[PDB]
């Protein structure tokens, strides 16, 4: 809780490279991850990854708990790394009451709100649906960070739609004076969307994020991006490790397949269907390393 992660990393080094009775445990890794996550000095995003690499010690009973997954989700969301945030949020969901621990009473940036907004901005709404239906099961209300844009239509149900930064037709004309009176004005202070010189987050949704909010993309863009990336890794696998296949019509099949796949990224469909990509299976790579595969 000091703010300098080095004073905690020194203790962690004293514990890790010491005797057996002073070896660290899950709580020690959690404290050091918290010290490196909630700092206010520099990047500290590679240190957390190195520490999580050190935390891969199966035989030392170093297993993660709810707080470990919560801190990892928070750290990877605050640095705009969502493809690991969702991976760790799944494990946090496997435990009971993980969403309550992730929402640490709204004390530090409301990590649950930041995670929901990160899922909303990038348009990965299938993940958001899981993240939403995992909340009412644990009886967790929505945090007050339901930030609306200057155009009063921005919510978790608006970004993924095709029109972006566009008001929706609601029949009667927009009551600009009524919106001005309701949001503020005539008393106190109003959030004035005026650029300034100081390096302060202008948009109110970039309050918790370290650098800035992730790039705003609708669901169609994300779907086409994941489709083209799937086809790109398929062609990359078939290029080097896919010279031979079960079909013996390669002379006329490969010439068509290469051009089809290169034109898709920028009825002969089953030939690509049975193409099986071996990714994430450690047994396959172990067999290939042993010399069998």
């Amino acid at each position: 809780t000091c703010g300098i992660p080095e004073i905690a990393f020194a203790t962690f080094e004293n514990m890790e490279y010491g005797e057996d009775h002073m070896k660290p445990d899950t709580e020690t890794y959690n404290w050091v991850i918290q010290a490196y996550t909630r700092a206010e000095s520099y990047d500290r995003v590679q240190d957390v990854a190195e520490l999580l690499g050190m935390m891969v010690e199966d035989h030392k009973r170093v297993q993660p708990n709810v707080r470990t997954y919560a801190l990892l989700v928070e750290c990877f969301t605050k640095y705009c790394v969502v493809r690991e945030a969702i991976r760790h949020f799944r494990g946090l969901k496997n435990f009971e009451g993980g969403t309550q621990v992730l929402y640490n009473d709204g004390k530090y940036g409301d990590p649950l709100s930041l995670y929901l907004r990160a899922l909303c901005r990038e348009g990965r709404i299938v993940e958001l649906l899981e993240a939403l239906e995992a909340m009412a099961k644990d009886n967790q209300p929505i945090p007050p960070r339901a930030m609306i844009l200057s155009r009063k239509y921005r919510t978790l149900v608006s970004s993924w739609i095709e029109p972006l930064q566009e008001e929706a037709e609601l029949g009667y004309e927009i009551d600009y004076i009524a919106r001005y009176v309701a949001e503020g004005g005539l008393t106190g202070d109003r959030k004035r969307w005026v650029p300034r010189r100081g390096k302060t987050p202008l948009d109110p949704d970039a309050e918790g994020f370290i650098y800035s909010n992730p790039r705003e993309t609708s669901f169609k863009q994300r779907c086409l991006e994941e489709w083209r990336l799937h086809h790109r890794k398929l062609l990359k696998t078939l290029h080097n490790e896919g010279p031979s296949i079960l079909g013996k019509i390669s002379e006329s099949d490969y010439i068509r397949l290469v051009e089809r796949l290169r034109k898709i990224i920028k009825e002969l469909d089953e030939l690509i269907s049975r193409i099986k990509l071996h990714e994430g299976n450690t047994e396959f790579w172990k067999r290939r390393f042993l010399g069998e595969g």
Binding site: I125, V126, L128, L129, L132, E133, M135, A136, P141, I142, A146, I148, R151, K152, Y153, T155, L156, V157, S158, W160, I161, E162, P163, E167, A168, E169, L170, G171, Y172, F219, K220, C223, L224, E226, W227, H230, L277, E279, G280, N281
Partner: protein
């Protein structure tokens, strides 16, 4: 391993509205209240791609939440319901409109009544 190696699903507007209706109903169940534009945009998306299967619920949720849209937009939906030949959906729409209490313009009212009598 079960999800990482499965090929993704292609994009479609019907899938978009099918996920949007469930997202909005679960965020309402969770304790969140979307604004008028939040449902206006999903209504626009639902009327872009013809799908009158959810036209009743997308407005029943809005008029149960406590928000009402403008009059010049409740007629385009009811005339597109007849444009593609979905008269039962139009009957359901006028039924829930009478149940809610919104005043439909008399011109489109007699238009949909004539369409009904043509279907009757």
């Amino acid at each position: 391993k079960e999800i990482k190696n499965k090929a993704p699903q292609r994009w479609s507007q019907e899938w978009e509205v099918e996920l949007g209706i469930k997202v909005m109903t679960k965020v309402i169940e969770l304790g969140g209240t979307p604004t008028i534009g939040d449902c206006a945009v999903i209504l626009r998306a639902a009327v872009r791609a013809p799908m009158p299967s959810a036209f009743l619920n997308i407005l029943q949720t809005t008029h149960s939440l406590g928000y009402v849209f403008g009059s010049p937009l409740y007629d385009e939906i009811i005339t597109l319901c007849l444009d593609l030949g979905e008269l039962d959906a139009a009957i359901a729409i006028v039924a829930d409109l009478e149940t809610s209490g919104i005043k439909v313009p008399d011109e489109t009212l007699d238009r949909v009544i004539s369409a009904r009598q043509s279907s009757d």
